């Protein structure tokens, strides 16, 4: 019996003092269960995560729910272990909160189930696997200019309202239905409305009963929103370690991990860093993201949406997570306001997969020539913006003429965007879009109007839309 008092309550941060020699280690869960002795008190079922050691046998913790009601002197239970999330075949088809408790009204998990701790070290050097094979998505910019790596880390960089949740739902619709394995969705600081819509789409399309869903949405206090991704990650780790199975991680707004760390770091006694972010902005995201790996047992292909604050790609939280990703797609608001959806920057989006030995010679030549014409059109936008299209020297006019067609044929109708416009959406194979961009780069479709290429799957659909326009 080693139980302690509450010393300080500092927002989402609770100081707990134990007796000497009985302090818990860092990352252990602590429990507060209070029963409101009189009418001036509130029933409390709150849990705490140990973060620091302060001296004078006092422990600096981070709470997982709201601290509204805590009194200085309440009794804190030490569980002797980190936050143990129940895991196994039980999590398939279920929805969980941060503590591993089911929030889907289908029942509760017994105490006899196997449960793994949230906090564990990353896999070592000798355990990793670095094979690069292409995950086909059906998105033309993704298939051509930044191929997604099967078993690798994928990042979706965008601002607010730029086309990022729609793109990760299109990736779910294209990939997760035919994966033949376990998926895990982790909603970290997104809309609770989008947690309901996506659950009912999983129930409709039957992708549930092989997915496990964790929602720590933006109503939750930041101590929850930090550990959401770690709960969903240890659910993925059971499958890829114990069962050796291919796992999909979809994480929407992994920026909210670092932001929820930044909300607590000021109250943890830490000094501020660049742009108000914790000093540990790199190692807190290294303890999470270096742990999302493929091993020799099984693989995790993680597709992560990453919020970009104030449309600033040089912000320290998006800038330090580029170094973790195999493939990145950088969504731009300038392309979203042109009606180009997916609003993927074709130049700034890169991949480790785009190589001739991985994809093929002709794919690589078409992709690099597309990037060359788009860079040459990007270098002419000052002359076009001031002097116009009139003084380009008849090859730059040809570059602009083909590059408008290329930048519009990168745009594509989605199955998800059928509820937005009514157009039913398309799935484009990789050879079809390589043949399409090769036919555009050869000048086969210079006679068609440039608005005929907007939001179109294939070039046969380009031609039928252009003859529906009148050409």
């Amino acid at each position: 019996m080693t139980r302690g008092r509450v010393i300080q309550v500092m927002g989402p941060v609770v100081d707990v003092k134990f007796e000497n020699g009985h302090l818990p280690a860092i990352y252990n869960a602590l429990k507060i269960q209070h029963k409101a002795r009189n009418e001036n008190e509130v029933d409390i079922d709150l849990t705490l995560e140990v973060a620091l050691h302060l001296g004078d046998d006092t422990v600096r913790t981070i709470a997982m729910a709201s601290t509204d009601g805590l009194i200085r002197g309440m009794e804190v239970i030490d569980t002797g272990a980190p936050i143990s999330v129940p895991v196994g075949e039980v999590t398939l088809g279920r929805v969980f909160n941060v503590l591993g408790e089911p929030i889907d009204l289908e029942g509760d998990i017994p105490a006899d189930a196997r449960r793994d701790p949230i906090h564990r070290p990353a896999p070592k050097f000798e355990e990793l696997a670095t094979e690069v094979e292409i995950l086909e998505t059906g998105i033309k910019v993704v298939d051509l200019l930044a191929p997604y790596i099967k078993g690798g880390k994928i990042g979706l960089f965008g601002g607010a309202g730029v086309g990022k949740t729609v793109l990760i739902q299109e990736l779910i619709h294209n990939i997760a239905q035919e994966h033949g394995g376990i998926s895990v969705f982790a909603g970290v600081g997104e809309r609770t409305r989008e947690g309901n819509d996506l659950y009912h789409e999983m129930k409709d399309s039957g992708v549930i009963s092989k997915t496990a869903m964790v929602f720590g949405q933006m109503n939750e206090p930041p101590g929850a929103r930090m550990r959401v991704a770690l709960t969903g990650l240890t659910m993925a780790e059971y499958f890829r370690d114990e069962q050796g199975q291919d796992v999909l991680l979809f994480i929407d707004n992994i920026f909210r991990f670092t932001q929820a760390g930044s909300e607590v770091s000021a109250l943890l006694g830490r000094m501020p860093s660049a742009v108000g972010y914790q000093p540990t902005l790199a190692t807190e995201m290294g303890q999470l993201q270096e742990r999302i790996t493929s091993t020799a047992k099984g693989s995790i292909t993680s597709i992560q949406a990453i919020y970009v604050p104030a449309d600033d790609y040089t912000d320290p939280a998006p800038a330090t997570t580029f170094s973790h990703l195999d493939a990145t797609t950088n969504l731009e608001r300038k392309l979203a306001e042109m009606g180009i959806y997916p609003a993927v920057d074709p130049l700034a989006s890169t991949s480790r997969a785009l190589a001739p030995e991985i994809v093929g010679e002709e794919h690589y030549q078409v992709a690099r020539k597309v990037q060359q014409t788009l860079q040459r059109y990007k270098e002419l936008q000052d002359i076009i913006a001031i002097l116009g299209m009139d003084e380009l020297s008849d090859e730059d006019k040809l570059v602009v003429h083909r590059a408008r067609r290329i930048q519009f044929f990168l745009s594509q109708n989605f199955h998800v965007a059928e509820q937005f416009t009514g157009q039913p959406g398309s799935y484009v194979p990789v050879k079809e879009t390589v043949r399409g961009f090769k036919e555009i780069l050869e000048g086969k479709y210079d006679h068609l109007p440039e608005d005929a290429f907007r939001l179109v799957g294939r070039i046969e659909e380009v031609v039928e839309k252009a003859k529906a326009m009148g050409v």
Partner: protein, 494 residues
Amino acid sequence: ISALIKQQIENYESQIQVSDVGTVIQVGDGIARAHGLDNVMSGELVEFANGVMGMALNLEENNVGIVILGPYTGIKEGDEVRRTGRIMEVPVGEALIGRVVNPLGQPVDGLGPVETTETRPIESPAPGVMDRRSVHEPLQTGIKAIDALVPIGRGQRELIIGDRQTGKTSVAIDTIINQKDQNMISIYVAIGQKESTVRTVVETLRKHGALDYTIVVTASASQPAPLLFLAPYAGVAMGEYFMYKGKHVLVVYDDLSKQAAAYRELSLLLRRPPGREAYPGDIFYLHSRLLERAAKLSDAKGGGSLTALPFVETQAGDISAYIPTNVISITDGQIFLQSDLFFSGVRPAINAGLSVSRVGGAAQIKAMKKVAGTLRLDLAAYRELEAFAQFGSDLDKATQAKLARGARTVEVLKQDLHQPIPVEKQVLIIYALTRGFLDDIPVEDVRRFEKEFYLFLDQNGQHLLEHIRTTKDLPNEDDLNKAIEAFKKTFVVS
């Protein structure tokens, strides 16, 4: 097994283990404070009760600021810290060659223990002004834009700087792959990277036979910022072990900006006052301590050298940031990689106008100077005259011929990935460029001309290549002309 155990029990001597200790005040974020430890030194290995090492940096009056070099989750308030009695050291030797190693010196690749006999301190003074010699011998990278326009010598540190996905790590790996013929010992220090990226780099080194002479030092992002802080100093200590023996070492520091972020974290958690961008005061001193240790010693100090290639990642081309302008003001020249040139087909994306080599000319061989002194003039004239060819009426025939020569210069300076070119073929292809042997050939065939011309030099001629390898000079400018014209007979223009 049991006979050796019985022999070591018979050789065992029991003594009293004496130790200076001290109890921990605070544990957290890879940082510990501790009472006691009255006789510790600044910058000292000190170890906890778990076996986890720590570095004693801040010695205040009543406590010690210990910097934890491992997983701190087992360390609690009240544990004791044991004074190891020695400064923070790195195990060095020939056994590190071909091994992926911790900055503490433990093997990370999992191929057994590393059998080293002696160590070096991780904090050592640089060679003085009298201890060095001027840089005069080439560090051949194999990239023709580097080995022609921004040359690197042995004993020189060169900053390769640019945005993300511009080609920095590829320049590093290609430079390390080229050192197979030379007596160079490479060291690739991977700082703050994803560890599967480090494994991809190690496997591309093993595929090209580069692990016979290189040492990979990895400090991944899951490791604490104390281990990212001590990774370049461990790398340069492993380098200077061979440098003070007479060997020649290349030390590649991939993303020293992540070392700057790790030391910013390390100083903010030790409650040191910030500066601009919350980096601490001695961040220039941090980078200068490791980039002044790269030198070329004199013939009294052994003659060995250590050339360095630090990397700095910029944010959207902001070259005027704090860590880029700190490292630009230290290194002996810069190599600017730009995405504007990278996505225009020009790869390696070296902006040779902005890129400076401050040793340059003493680094090149005598053939490369004669051949590249007009390469730089032709490319500078093309960069200046391309600005008037963007729009407008036209230019006359003379500077259009200059633009054609410059377009073929740009097409010469392009390479493929992980294909380093020897210097005797670089001087021949840039000799063919600058003497006018490419004006017959269109711009879209210069790469295939170079690819077939290297094969022609391998199977025909080849007395020119031996002349450039032995004498380091051009073979008298007439056998070259007849060999290039004999190949231009063979070449079929598309």
